[PDB]
Symmetry: D2
Subunit: 440 residues, 4 copies
């Protein structure tokens, strides 16, 4: 699966449709980023710039100009071609090939941007710009507007209105197209395959990072070179740390391991969590906590549909959790009183669901307390968990247990589709999978 | 292999030994670095801060104070402990545990640095600071010195002399200790194992990135989670691009593949290049170029020793190259005239050798044209290559061939030790290794 | 004459009337300005901040909030009272006295602005801000908007639209109210008195700066402590330099002296130029150039009225000038051809007229080539001049002559009113005035 | 009096003498400074740049290069000549005329500084630079050093040591040469003439600013165009505000007026304070406070000499003050106990003496509590005062009285010379002077 030329074109048009007449929108590429000294991290394009271009170079700027309600055109600034820079650091699109390759009307050298950008904004009424996203962008934009402001004797005028395009663009990204869902579907499959492999490879005596290596190799073999976020492999008490990425410990027989990992496929994020016994067999105490988290996930997957909200499903999860914990003697008292006192918060201290897309924690307005009514095309995670601290004042057998189970879904017309159900989560199925692998 | 507490202590003392009396040296940690939106790249500590601390947190500053020629002490600023930040993002050293863990006299909260740093520099004559390394550091340091400058009514005075410690510290890093060599030795072994595996797995129809996945998995299984630089896998004409990292192409029977990859083990970089046929059998034309590059490497490995230089060995390599190319009809004319006209430069257009250590392109003064006389403890690469452009005006059979062969060495008392010789480079040995694997 | 409380109130309301509902306008005070080391120049408030407040302290910000089409309110941030800062640097308004004194609804400490401003902008749709006017303002505003942008979990939202209020406010300042005209009328009288005094005091052997001292003393005695711009006193060849402020030369019998000087009365600028003989008697050559400049001024004063433009009157001046110069043999050829070739530009190389108000070069849109149709209430200068370079290739007697004559006017319903006609400009009247004084 | 070419040359050499061999010192000119919109304050050169050049243009940089202990040379960067910029804003030195006019070896265009400065610092060991003085300077200097740091392949190296030249240069400025003393002597005379005139012109009903106008006119007529600081004219209760510059009040019969004003002559500051009755006749209550302040001044003028300190003389002044106040019933108790409790501080709350030179609050180290031993050539103020608040709990007749009397002196071999004694300070002499004038 991939995103077509035509889809990138549609997105630009959909933004232009919402822009005021006599305006220009400016979307900047991400800077390169130092890892150490002269070496750089692998390049990651800005998600919003990527969304309208599918162009993976730095030092580029998309300018969409709306002259009026039926006339508009696109200008790309990008790096000029250069034999020496390309023998070294690899090929560039340049200006000649860009109009056709990327479907833009004009392409200009990024090195000429300060000489050209103000001429493009001259006489417009509005400029859409994401101020404070990048410093190099703010410098370029403020420098253009100052030229126009001070150039009234050269008959130049600046647009007096500056509008943030992020709310508009993030509201667009919140609703996935059929193509986007097809890509995210494959990101979910790739990620599931990686998690199944981690379960099948796990043995006591391996280190947490060994499972990270297995996962990343699986991402890569399907053409997802990078993860969408830093992989979490928290065995034992490390599973009580929500974003544990040290992954430095020897995995011990008797412990659970919590794996939170997701690939990045064509820009889009997978995001799955699975928790399982290192030795392939859940203890009674481990099952008791795991069952509460699994019921939470399974109930949420039933409930999520158009018309409800993350807040409303979260409330049901809290009920399931508080009731389960009371039955184990981890909480004491009346369920409804405990719910009203948020007595689950020491054990479940994060949100159930976030938007998913070009970023793992994707853009889009949630509403107060995540009360926004869900609609078809919204893509989100379902990620209940329970984390009992090593020093919690609860029965000994629950102390130092961290369990999360997380799936990725898309809201459909009548309910939801689970993108990550191809990796098992029922305990009996986890155990069968690990036994099968240990034979072979 | 690892670096001991005592070794970190020795390094600090070695720097303090060179500092003026009545001075303080300020060494800042690296900032966290955004990959996209709220997600961050895996943290990489500043190599110089790492060198004196082996401490892998951001928002930390080492202050070494030399009161006089026998009195000095160390102060660490680091992140305070915090239960909520640690349930989320994982554990912190804090101030209580830091003196013992890191061998410093005092530890203070990074959040108090602007209230404390000027009190530490008050009345000193010199401050050692790497100006322009990090903006957040320059702001902290300039803000401290301004307080002191303007506080003469509170009996405060600023050191009038600011010295860059980088030349001193980089001259220290240039000469590896026995422990550093032991670590780099293991980085070389780990990297060699990865390159052997890539050769053994390569088949036509696999993609360049598939070999990247194999390599990274091998790094990880030996406890080197990250590469020291972005992995290069350039098959066919892609091998003519020196830092090709797209690794996006299907590998074709008939083509060579150039793999440039290195692990990062305990901070230290491996750096190996091997070029081999995708189908396991070099053609006559491929052998003809490969043999020139291999002779270049083998001769350089014989020559490198105390007393010579990168420049002097490079001159021998150029002779070997120009002579080989003339014999193939790729160059025409008198060898010595061609050498004097640098007629190899269209085909070999980079340096033979760089320093290697905590950075792949390691710190240390090279001298003019890399004429610095080599001494025991210097660690460096030997990396001859020949790159014939797809459109070079040479016999057809050499066009689009990129070959590099690179090993890592340390200068010893009587010659050099090859850290990366455990992966094969003689063509007959490459071919045997790939045939053996293809059986199985 | 002065500006009333009620007038400041009217101005704010007139701006609020034009603002969108659910918006806030932010108007910042000028920073203090170093002259040398710890000493500062006399404080000059930002003209726009002054316009809405008549408040002459630094570190102040006016926030006008339009909740909707009938509800709005004002908030002032200003310096808190402080006994020690006031024993030293003199009295402050503070927060208690500000609402009544300045007619604002609320007053808050400037030192709390970063804690309060974002709460004032929370949930608004638009913010009016003059971006790039002051750096300290941009930092305050961007810091507030970032808090709101990132505070969606605390139910905060930033206005997505930022609008420059300068075009609106400068269009307001362009049309003077009856009170403003009364003040500018007195600024013109004060300035005229100063220029008359300079003529009456001038003797050969005095220095240019001596006339500057006379002028400034006259400004001050009428309660205009500061000039509106740096005083020009260019005798002889110095009169060929348009903004000559060195005023360092001995004034010579035989030379003309050009005095360009203006007071600042209650914020408003006077701006007069008079040129006269140092010895009180114009030569034939001096009269010949002076008469052309005077006819230019006198014709322009007849012509300026609603319905015409600076461009249209400038064209008449150019005709008068080119014709006069041709008659003197300073230009050669056909008048209309010379006009079409802009042959006056070596001698008259600046505009005839600029807007006048709180700034000497006052705000307001001129239109292309200053073609904007004039309307009652516009206040402007009329300032023709001719400058013949010491090395111009013209008859010897005109070389090194600089003459400008400048008056300040306001456009009325049927023509214009001359605010600066109380200082003489007809040569016979200049000469009588200087003879009378010499007796003283 | 003026400062010779030779003296500027001597100063540069005296600095070069103290510089390390293989170093360059960088001294930047002051920026132009906005008063409002496009209008600028009168230009004031940086005192340190002025000290070595007597050059009064912006955008200039003096580079003094010490190659070794007998070889050094000077380079000026300054504005290029330009006919259009000079017809408008007046003449420029340029590069051709600068070597001779300013006694420098080479002059280069300021517009080429980023292309040339790094070539001047290449290969030096030390750079003397006043970091944080001006932002435009820090940008220029850091940009040069970065070029050198990163240009090792072009055989460039940066000086690793940066030293603040301000301590050295300010220690030079602290000791005035015979020429400097001659100029400061004339600044004292000019300032005294102005203060005598203010006394002679004062009548009840005049405003405070009227005396400011008289003073400034007197400065100007002697060729001191600008004051060295903003003039203070505090009548009545305004005299209790130390730096009262509003000067807005009608002067009332019965009140004292405190005038603090100083001219700037050839860069050097006069600084005199005189307090006198508005109506020409001191009351008993006014005399009682005035006599304490005058005894303080007269005793200090006797005491100041090489070997003592500002601290030591201040202690004598405090004794005189506490004793006087006790006799008036303004303080109660034992003199020595009151002195030990600093019981004078409500009434005398500033220092007695500051250094005087190119800045009114001149550069130079004071020592702890101003304990530095005085030496011939030091120039300083002597400025005791007593300020009784309108609401002080003291006998009614002393409330709202502000009196300061300040003279400028230079330490000589055997004592001091009073530069400002030509304006009267004994009350009987003040009264005679005002009576004489009233006849005018
Ligand atoms: Mg347990
Ligand atoms: Mg071929
Ligand atoms: Mg003449
Ligand atoms: Mg009284
Ligand atoms: Mn997750
Ligand atoms: Mn998630
Ligand atoms: Mn390599
Ligand atoms: Mn290498
Ligand atoms: Mn004028
Ligand atoms: Mn004017
Ligand atoms: Mn004073
Ligand atoms: Mn003083």
């Amino acid at each position: 699966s991939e995103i077509s030329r035509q889809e990138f074109q549609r997105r630009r048009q959909a933004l232009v449709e919402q822009m005021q007449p006599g305006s220009a929108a400016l979307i900047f590429a991400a800077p390169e980023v130092t890892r150490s000294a002269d070496s750089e991290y692998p390049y990651r394009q800005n998600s919003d710039f990527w969304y309208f271009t599918g162009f993976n170079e730095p030092e580029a700027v998309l300018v969409l100009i709306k002259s009026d309600d039926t006339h508009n055109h696109s200008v790309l600034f990008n790096r000029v071609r250069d034999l020496t820079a390309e023998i070294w650091f690899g090929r560039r699109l340049g200006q000649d090939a860009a109009p056709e390759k990327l479907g833009v009307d004009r392409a200009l050298a990024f090195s000429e941007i300060n000489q050209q950008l103000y001429q493009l904004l001259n006489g417009l009424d509005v400029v859409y710009h994401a101020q404070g996203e990048y410093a190099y962008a703010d410098v370029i934009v403020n420098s253009a507007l100052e030229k126009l402001r001070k150039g009234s004797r050269q008959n130049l005028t600046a647009p007096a209105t500056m509008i943030d395009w992020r709310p508009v663009v993030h509201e667009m990204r919140l609703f996935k197209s059929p193509e986007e869902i097809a890509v995210l579907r494959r990101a979910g499959e790739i990620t599931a395959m990686a998690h199944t492999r981690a379960m099948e490879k796990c043995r006591p005596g391996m280190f947490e990072y060994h499972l990270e290596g297995e996962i990343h190799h699986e991402f890569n073999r399907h053409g997802a070179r990078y993860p969408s976020y830093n992989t979490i492999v928290g065995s034992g008490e490390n599973g009580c740390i929500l974003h544990y990425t040290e992954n430095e410990c020897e995995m011990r027989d008797g412990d659970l391991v919590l794996i939170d990992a997701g690939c990045e496929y064509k820009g889009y994020a997978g995001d799955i969590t699975r928790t399982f016994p290192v030795n392939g067999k859940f203890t009674q105490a481990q099952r008791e906590i795991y069952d509460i988290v699994l019921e939470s996930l399974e109930t949420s997957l039933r409930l999520y549909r158009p018309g409800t909200s993350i807040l409303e499903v979260t409330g049901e999860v809290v009920r399931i959790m508080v009731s389960g914990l009371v039955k184990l003697g981890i909480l004491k008292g009346d369920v409804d009183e405990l719910i009203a006192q948020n007595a689950h918060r020491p054990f479940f201290m994060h949100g159930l669901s976030h938007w998913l897309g070009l970023d793992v924690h994707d853009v889009g307005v949630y509403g107060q307390d995540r009360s926004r009514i869900l609609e078809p095309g919204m893509v989100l995670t379902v990620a209940p968990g329970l984390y009992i601290a090593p020093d919690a004042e609860v029965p000994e057998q629950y102390r130092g247990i961290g369990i999360r189970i997380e799936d990725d879904i898309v809201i459909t017309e009548t309910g939801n589709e689970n993108l990550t159900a191809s990796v098992v989560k029922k305990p009996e199925e986890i155990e069968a999978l690990m036994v099968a692998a240990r034979k072979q």
